[PDB]
């Protein structure tokens, strides 16, 4: 009493996928003979009749019809490798009440149990790598990854299923791309979004192109991680046709995902032989033909039928024609109840899909090597802790860790310039005491003393200003910083306006007297103009602190540490026009004083004994002011050098004018 099994699969050596059909024929004969030895289906015996489809839909359909007509009444359909024939047969299975159990069809399309209700398969679908990959993202905590898909339905199904798989989780798809012939455009598109971990879905031919495209963008090395399919041929990178060594450089570190050919557990299976014993038996029996990955998936397949038929005999078979509906339903239930340990692992079906294992591998310097594996029945991930190697210390990060640090003024430079300022201020305080002490004397009485003291006050205020405008804002809080930005503007404006109003009034009265109380009125008028300007500036639109962010240039490490220099300026909304009007109002007056000094450098009036040296003093002030303003606005981006230059300009200008004005008086009085 024979039980026939209509087994469709490619066998001809002309068809490319023939290496599948022949490759699993040893393992099949391994199973069947075992079933004939142990006598499981006794008194019945299994008889698997083989039929060729040639992976052409017409020839496959004709083979199916010839099997149905010219053959004994088969109980179950088995096989189907290439997707078109298996789909066309699985869809029409219901017309004859025949259940099919495939071992090589990997198309996700066969998961729809409304269209293909009788189709089962022991090999995992292509999309089964999605719930695995997800767990891997949970393992390294990669939450930002971009997808690069080939424009084909086979990979488009996996790309579309990945979205539904990641749904409800803390994973974000920052970039989605699709490509057909040239991936480099989608490569640069992905790089535009600053992605570090990519999930690519494409065939073997597109793989080399996408990987050279990643090479071009420097999408390799430490900070990048590719996740691609793993059913590629071995040594696939060595395809005669991009550079080769650069290819092996860009490929290094990519992770491939596939399905596990055989269970790694050394446990006894349903047949009583561990996966390694079955592997040795298969390798011996297949002495000539080359191996195929699906070989174990054929072995358990026969078992998945055999046990099934046993349960069928439990429910009750030679009566079966293709009109029997209840028998087909019984066999369907019996196959659905399948739960047993076979060579490919636990064999259990969820809605006709095998709940199986996924295999993670990684390229290392010549070749692929296993690094982990995922169990979908337990939904657990198990990574070989040591074999995974990374260029950097840790797994690369998904997003960029940009820490906006704030550029700071050098503490030693500020301290040394502050010490020089205190020294100059002590000198000014000594000169003021020398002036006030010798006021009764005639020679100090001749040169206008009140204007000279006004000059000392100007220099002293400029020194306090030089204290102020280097605080950098890091020393102090924000509100104090804005208040001090206003205070230093006040103090520097007043200290310049008085110090130059004195030196201007003196030369003005020299010139006027040569042509042919009030000096203080002149300086007071200048002070009133400056005070009105400052109060208008303060009341209309006050200065506030703002932060400038630069080009994110530095990378002071081998880490992914990219800092943006955050510099700090206190400036107004329309501060350009304010600063322009102030600089112009003071520069015109400086030029005026310089011209008057040159005109009157030759006149000698005893009422102003120090007009000549005041000429050189106003020259100093003018030149130093021009240089300081130019080099200040020319170096807004560098705080340290700009502060150093401006502080040296202020110090040298003020100290040299004070020295020029007051030293000859003391050289005369002390001798």
């Amino acid at each position: 009493p024979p039980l026939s099994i209509m087994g469709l699969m490619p066998l001809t050596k002309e068809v490319a996928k023939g290496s599948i059909g022949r490759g699993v024929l040893p393992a099949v004969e391994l199973a069947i003979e075992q079933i004939r030895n142990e006598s499981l289906l006794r008194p019945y015996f299994l008889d698997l009749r083989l039929y060729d489809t040639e992976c052409d839909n017409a020839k496959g359909l004709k083979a199916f019809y010839d099997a149905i007509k010219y053959g004994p009444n088969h109980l179950m359909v088995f096989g189907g490798v290439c997707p078109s024939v298996t789909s066309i047969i699985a869809e029409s299975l219901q017309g004859w009440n025949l259940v099919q159990l495939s071992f090589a069809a990997t198309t996700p399309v066969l998961a729809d149990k409304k269209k293909y209700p009788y189709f089962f398969r022991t090999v995992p679908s292509d999309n089964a790598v999605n719930p695995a990959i997800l767990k891997l993202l949970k393992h390294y905590q990669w939450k930002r990854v971009g997808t690069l898909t080939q424009d084909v339905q086979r990979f488009s199904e996996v790309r579309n299923d990945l979205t539904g798989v990641l749904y409800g989780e803390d994973i974000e798809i920052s970039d989605t791309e699709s490509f057909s012939n040239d991936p480099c455009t989608s490569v640069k598109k992905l790089k535009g979004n600053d992605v570090r971990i990519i999930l690519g879905q494409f065939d073997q031919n597109m793989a080399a192109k996408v990987f050279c495209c990643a090479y071009e963008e420097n999408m390799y090395g430490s900070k990048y991680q590719w996740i691609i399919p793993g059913w590629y041929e071995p040594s696939w990178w060595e395809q005669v046709h991009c550079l080769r060594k650069n290819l092996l450089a860009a490929m290094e570190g990519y992770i491939g995902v596939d399905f596990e050919p055989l269970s790694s557990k050394q446990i006894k299976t349903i047949s009583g032989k561990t996966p390694q014993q079955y592997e040795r038996e298969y390798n011996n029996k297949r002495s000539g033909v080359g191996p195929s990955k699906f070989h174990g998936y054929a072995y358990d397949g026969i078992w998945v039928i055999a046990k099934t038929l046993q349960r069928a005999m439990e429910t009750l078979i030679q009566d079966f024609n293709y009109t029997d509906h209840t028998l087909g339903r019984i066999i369907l239930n019996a196959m659905n109840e399948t739960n047993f340990f076979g060579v490919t692992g636990q064999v259990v079906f969820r809605n006709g899909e095998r709940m199986g294992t996924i295999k993670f591998t990684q390229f290392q310097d010549s070749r692929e090597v296993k690094v982990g594996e995922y169990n979908a029945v337990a939904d657990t991930l198990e990574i070989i802790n040591d074999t995974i190697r990374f260029q950097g210390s840790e797994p690369p990060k998904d997003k960029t860790i940009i820490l906006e640090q704030l550029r700071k003024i050098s503490l030693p430079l500020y301290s040394i310039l502050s010490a020089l300022t205190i020294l100059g201020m002590i000198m000014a305080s000594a000169f003021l005491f020398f002036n006030i002490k010798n006021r009764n004397q005639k020679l100090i009485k001749m040169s206008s003393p009140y204007m000279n003291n006004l000059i000392i006050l100007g220099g002293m205020l400029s020194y306090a200003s030089i204290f102020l405008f280097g605080l950098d804002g890091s020393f102090v809080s924000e509100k104090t910083f804005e208040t001090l930005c206003t205070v230093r503007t006040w103090i520097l404006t007043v200290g310049y306006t008085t110090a130059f109003g004195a030196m201007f009034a003196k030369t003005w009265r020299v010139h006027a007297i040569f042509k042919n109380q009030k000096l203080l009125v002149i300086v007071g008028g200048m002070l009133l103009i400056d005070l009105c300007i400052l109060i208008c500036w303060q009341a209309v639109d006050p200065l506030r602190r703002t932060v400038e962010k630069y080009s994110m240039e530095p990378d002071p490490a081998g880490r992914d540490i990219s800092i943006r220099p955050l510099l700090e300026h206190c400036e107004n909304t329309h501060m350009t026009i304010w600063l322009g009007i102030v600089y112009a109002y003071k520069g015109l007056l400086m030029l005026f004083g310089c011209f008057l000094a040159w005109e009157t450098r030759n006149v000698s009036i005893p009422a102003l004994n120090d007009s000549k040296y005041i000429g050189m003093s106003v020259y100093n002030v003018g030149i130093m002011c021009i240089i300081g303003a130019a080099v200040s606005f020319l170096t807004r981006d560098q705080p340290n050098v700009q502060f150093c230059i401006v502080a040296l300009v202020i110090i040298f200008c003020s100290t040299i004018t004070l020295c020029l004005v007051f030293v000859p008086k003391l050289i005369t009085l002390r001798t």
């Binding site: 017409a58 359909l61 149905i68 007509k69 869809e91 029409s92 219901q94 269209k115």
Partner: protein, 681 residues
């Protein structure tokens, strides 16, 4: 002599997605009765039909295909109705050497002679809508066409074909979209994208949602034109649907005025077919045979396709005719019947039946337009002869079709003409006075009064005034008079005339004032050397400006100044200019230098107000002049910078400043000397 049976294997969809068989079965069972009783068509063989109900399901159709193929009698041809079953049978048939003949398979994929080597169909592919559409585009000159589609294989293949169909005719598909069930985001992208000619490929259910989303977006009206498919029901936009919030009248507003294309599945004329029937007589006979009403029977507008298909098969068999011995393993009869079918050309109930190179039937397409809540046929198109019959019954809002895009008329802002004319006349009159005062000064150089004042310096001042006055001509004219070509010489002449005019005219005065001042603290050597130095510095600065950064025309664009009560074409104004690449930095140093010079001149002229020297007699009057010059220059210096736009006001300020400065300078210097020479002799 003997009538042998010749069997046809027919698969009729009695239900499913397309239940065409309910009317397709009688239309065949009628046609055979016409083909059998006629003794001139196939006098020897008698046609019969062994049909099965496929239910438009490949899984349910495979069993019936097996029942037909592997059961006697032998079938000579197959006939699949639906598209999927048709593809399956057309792919499988070549293993048995059987021709497949469909009547309702409209998928574009069925025109692939590599997969379906023996397939024919009387129903044209959906791609047949494309040659019509492109023609309509050329009929109205549209070249920017966006496409919105529903994610489905038929519409996707239609769009892929339309891309290459529009590439040949030199048209561009700018914006493409797709959507599975919700069309909101693609219509929003279209409205953002500003697409004018939109081609929409979606079913009826998605069509209602799409057009109510369009009513929300207001993607209808004058500018926007829509191309839809035309096999919907007539009142699809008036069908009640609770899945749409948008109402009936809003849909009548939105859909109204759109163009639709549909294959002509019945001959519009009143000619007779080979069966000796007309269209109306065939419809009458069919509804007589139908058990239900024509509106209830599925596939009623497809039945003439089945009739003509049976007639085409009959004519093929009659051409070949040996048919008694068909076996599934002989290819000879298959190729012969193939050559008979491929050479088919005959007038049936649906019109001229002829198959193209890929087995698809070529047929008319009717182009309709929705007017007043109803459809009105506006034209017909035959793609074989590429002839487009027009009835002139279409309508558009402004009497003409909307434009494919907004054109942007670039208008040029020109300086006013009466202003330029008046100001130029004023400047010419002023130049005349410079001629008079110059000649008067040169004639009387022998008198002692004019001898005392430095006459050559006043002559140089008059020459500078004349040059600055003459510089008003080029500084006014714009593209309106010059055009694009000669403009750089105009800008160069403006720059150089104004620069040298100011240089001489102000250098003479500043030299007079300086050399009075220096004497206050005399020979003509240094008096001439000073103006030499000043004019030389000016010439060198302007020459550097020339060599490093020569000036050139540069157009300035503006914001769209649309005019209303007109057609949707935005007017865009441009204001011509001409400037160095970095002109602010360049004219900056020049304005600063000249401003410092004018300020120092004002100060010196005030310092030497009361001073009196004989060798420079007129110097006090010079003081009265410089002020005016400086003031005007300052008041006119940044203002023209501020009023770069508004060319009219800028030219007014600049030229009035020039004219006033020149006039006042020429008066103040030369009038007193003139009257003193007159009244005294």
């Amino acid at each position: 002599s003997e009538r042998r049976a010749v069997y046809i294997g027919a698969l009729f969809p009695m239900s499913g997605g397309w239940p065409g068989g309910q009317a397709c079965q009688p239309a065949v069972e009628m046609a055979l009765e016409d083909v059998n009783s006629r003794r001139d068509i196939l006098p020897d063989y008698e046609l019969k039909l062994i049909h099965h109900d496929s239910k438009c399901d490949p899984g349910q159709a495979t069993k019936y295909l097996y029942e037909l193929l592997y059961n006697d009698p032998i079938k000579i041809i197959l006939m699949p109705g639906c598209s999927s079953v048709s593809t399956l049978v057309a792919e499988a048939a070549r293993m048995w050497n059987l021709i497949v003949l469909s009547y309702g398979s409209s998928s574009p994929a069925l025109s692939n002679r590599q997969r379906f080597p023996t397939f024919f169909r009387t129903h044209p592919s959906a791609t047949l809508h494309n040659p019509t559409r492109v023609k309509l585009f050329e009929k109205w000159g549209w070249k920017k066409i966006a496409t919105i589609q529903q994610t489905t294989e038929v519409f996707t293949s239609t769009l892929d074909d339309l891309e290459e169909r529009v590439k040949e005719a030199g048209i561009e598909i700018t914006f493409r979209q797709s959507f599975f069930s919700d069309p909101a985001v693609p219509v929003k992208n279209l409205k953002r994208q500003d697409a004018r000619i939109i081609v929409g490929l979606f079913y009826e259910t998605e069509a209602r949602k799409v057009f109510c989303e369009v009513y929300k977006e207001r993607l209808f009206g004058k500018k926007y034109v829509w191309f839809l498919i035309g096999w919907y029901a007539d009142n699809w936009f008036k069908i009640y649907d609770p899945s749409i919030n948008c109402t009936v009248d809003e849909m009548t507003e939105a859909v109204e005025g759109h163009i639709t294309t549909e294959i002509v599945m019945l001959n519009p004329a009143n000619t007779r077919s080979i069966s000796n029937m007309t269209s109306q007589e065939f419809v009458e006979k069919l509804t007589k045979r139908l058990k239900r009403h024509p509106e209830e029977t599925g596939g009623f507008q497809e039945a003439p396709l089945a009739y003509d298909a049976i007639w085409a098969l009959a004519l093929a068999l009659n051409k070949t005719s040996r048919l008694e011995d068909f076996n599934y393993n002989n290819q000879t009869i298959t190729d012969q019947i193939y050559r008979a079918m491929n050479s088919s050309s005959f007038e049936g109930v649906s019109g001229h039946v002829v198959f193209d190179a890929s087995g698809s039937r070529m047929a008319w397409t009717l182009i309709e337009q929705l007017q007043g809540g109803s459809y009105k046929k506006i034209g017909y198109y035959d793609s074989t002869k590429d002839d487009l019959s027009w009835s002139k019954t279409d309508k558009w809002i402004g009497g003409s079709p909307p434009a494919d895009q907004t054109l942007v008329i670039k208008t040029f802002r020109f300086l006013s003409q009466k202003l330029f004319i008046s100001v130029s006349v004023l400047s010419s009159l002023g130049i005349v006075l410079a001629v008079v005062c110059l000649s008067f000064n040169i004639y009387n150089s022998h008198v002692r009064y004019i001898q005392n004042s430095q006459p050559n310096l006043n002559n140089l001042t008059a020459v500078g005034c004349s040059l600055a006055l003459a510089a008003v001509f080029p500084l006014g004219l714009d593209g309106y008079h010059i055009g694009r070509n000669q403009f750089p010489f105009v800008c160069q002449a403006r720059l150089w005339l104004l620069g040298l005019g100011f240089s001489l005219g102000y250098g003479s005065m500043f030299t007079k004032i300086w050399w009075v001042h220096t004497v206050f603290t005399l020979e003509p050597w240094k008096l001439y050397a000073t103006v030499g130095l000043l004019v030389g510095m000016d010439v060198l600065t302007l020459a550097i400006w020339q060599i490093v950064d020569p000036l050139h025309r540069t157009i300035e664009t503006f914001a769209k100044e649309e005019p209303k009560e007109d057609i949707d074409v935005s007017i865009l104004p441009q204001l011509e200019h001409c400037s160095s690449r970095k002109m602010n930095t360049w004219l900056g140093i020049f304005y600063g230098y000249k401003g410092l010079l004018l300020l120092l001149g004002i100060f010196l002229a005030y310092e030497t107000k009361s001073v009196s020297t004989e060798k420079i007699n007129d110097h006090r009057a010079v003081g009265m002049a410089i002020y005016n010059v400086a003031v005007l220059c300052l008041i006119t210096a940044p203002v023209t910078m501020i009023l770069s736009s508004q060319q009219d006001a800028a030219f007014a300020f600049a030229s009035l400043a020039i004219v006033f400065s020149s006039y006042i300078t020429l008066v103040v210097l030369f009038v007193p000397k003139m009257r003193r020479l007159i009244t005294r002799g």
